[PDB]
Write a protein that binds this ligand. Structure first.
Ligand SMILES: COCCO[C@@H](C(=O)Nc1cncc2ccccc12)c1ccc(Cl)c(Cl)c1
Ligand SMILES: COCCO[C@H](C(=O)Nc1cncc2ccccc12)c1ccc(Cl)c(Cl)c1
Ligand SMILES: [Cl-]
Lengths: 305, 300
């Protein structure tokens, strides 16, 4: 019993965190094989950041300008290249702690674990979701740039996020491990604002299934709805549309709890229109949208890594 | 910016998780140096569960009865001893991944990270608080016994919890790493119930200070209160009494935000009376009590 916000075990990722220093800037790098990946803004000064030409800034840098540190051991940079907004520093030593890994770009609504680092040292791990507005509601202080987001599939770490910056509302923007930003953001000091966010409908339903598995059933009702009628109601409450793919993905949870997806949708519809009425679900007075259907199944079945 | 429930990186603890099998029972062990620590109930059968005599059950055991597995390598048990409700299995190999560590018993209200394991394999990590009723609201399935609770402050891992059982309400009971249970619980199938839980008042105040540091101020008011008047209000809402120690501990947050402890106490009093009125604090519609004053300062 119990439902917690649970991150993947961070051990395989901790073995990859290094400190990358370029001039006055110190941030984090992901050391995989003989390459260190880090945000390309590490090469910027306070003037550069305003309107930077990263190709021109990087051509002026030499390998000895990047000080890479893995623990108390300085790595030798033997090459540097740029792939979108990520800087790749070729090093003379392959990371012996490199896990089996892939680079994956995730979609809005997908969850991942963040290993927050400062000076190449992991300080904490937390579970977050890629918001529909392509920002993450992380917890990051200055120096966390280069901290990565990841999932674990069997014994393979899928790297999906690298932290680049914090937006004026306190939310975070970053890129996949190929340097492509999530959302309409750029790594330049200019006016940028996160779009109006929406609630991840499929994840709210997955969490309602997690509440039922845990014995919380007050919100259940005798009703069902059409997918179209539900989507018309959901869109009015700033909820993401629920697709047939989402209904299919919620199939195993529907089979386990005996609550059809459109049946749980009718409960969600009622919760939106009427509220919780002083009651809680899984210790929360709000509908939680950062547990995907796979997260719920994994946590309620004890899948190991 | 931002405030999240944040666990410590679990890597140093993952390197210690092993599977311990004794007969039909399989649970988790913590491999540190040449000793594997695990709940002593691993030696129990179904019939010796209501009233087990662990001293007598352990004397009948031999080292080859305990099958310890670290990954795909079986460890050889060269000795066994019992310290309170924890079983200590001496092994013929010191764990090369043993971190710098300490065993610390924590107090109610204190937080720690839990590395949930099944068959000696980590499946997830989360943040917990030791409830005032000495239970933890964990997320644990059958086979999670032996999973540990820890804090990792400055290179060293302080082990503070080892999971032993689930109570009838779904909450969890366990011991420190010396086998002493937290709370009035025993490792017997006898009727046991968690006491009436209460809110960790000092942690709620610490979280209100984190909300102020993050720019949330809607809940602040012009009032202050006496510590006694606050405690009389708080006790009526099932909140733990706030002691002078708690007020002292909240001093640095009070200095950073410019809001006196008794002043924030008046904000907490008002919130308890009024509710949130559709508003949230740090993305939560309830007052959060699993962030200690130390956690707030560390994270901010
Ligand atoms: C692998 O051996 C497990 C033995 O069962 C224990 C047991 O409740 N542990 C479990 C731990 N956590 C969550 C659980 C959720 C569902 C079921 C069990 C859970 C247990 C039972 C009664 C007593 Cl008195 C004791 Cl000392 C321990
Ligand atoms: C090591 O210095 C990195 C500086 O990164 C800045 C920056 O906001 N990053 C930070 C990251 N995360 C949380 C923060 C919380 C407080 C402060 C900063 C935070 C930043 C600012 C604007 C731009 Cl356009 C860019 Cl590319 C980067
Ligand atoms: Cl922490």
């Amino acid at each position: 019993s119990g439902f917690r916000k649970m991150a993947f075990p961070s051990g395989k990722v901790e073995g990859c965190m290094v400190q990358v220093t370029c001039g006055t800037t110190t941030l984090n790098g992901l050391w995989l094989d003989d390459v260190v990946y880090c945000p390309r803004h590490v090469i910027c000064t306070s003037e550069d950041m305003l309107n930077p030409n990263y190709e021109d800034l990087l051509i002026r840098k030499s390998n000895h300008n990047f000080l890479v540190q893995a623990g108390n051991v300085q790595l030798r940079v033997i090459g540097h290249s740029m792939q979108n907004c990520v800087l790749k520093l070729k090093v003379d030593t392959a990371n012996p702690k490199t896990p089996k890994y892939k680079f994956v770009r995730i979609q809005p609504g997908q969850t991942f674990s963040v290993l927050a680092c400062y000076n190449g040292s992991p300080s904490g791990v937390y579970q977050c979701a890629m918001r529909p507005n392509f920002t993450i509601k992380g917890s990051f202080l200055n120096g966390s740039c280069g901290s990565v987001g990841f999932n674990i599939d069997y014994d393979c770490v899928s790297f999906c996020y690298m932290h680049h910056m914090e937006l004026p509302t306190g939310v975070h923007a970053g890129t996949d491990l190929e340097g492509n930003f999530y959302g309409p953001f750029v790594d330049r000091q200019t006016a940028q604002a996160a779009g109006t966010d929406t609630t991840i409908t499929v994840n709210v339903l997955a969490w309602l299934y997690a509440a039922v598995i845990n014995g919380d059933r007050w919100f259940l009702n005798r009703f069902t709805t059409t997918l179209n009628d539900f989507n018309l109601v959901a869109m009015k409450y700033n909820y993401e549309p629920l697709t047939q793919d989402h209904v299919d993905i919620l199939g195993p949870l529907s089979a386990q709890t005996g609550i059809a997806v459109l049946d749980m949708c009718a409960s969600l519809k009622e919760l939106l229109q009427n509220g919780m009425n002083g009651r809680t679900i899984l210790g929360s007075a709000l509908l939680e949208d950062e547990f995907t259907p796979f997260d719920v199944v994994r946590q309620c079945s004890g899948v190991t890594f």
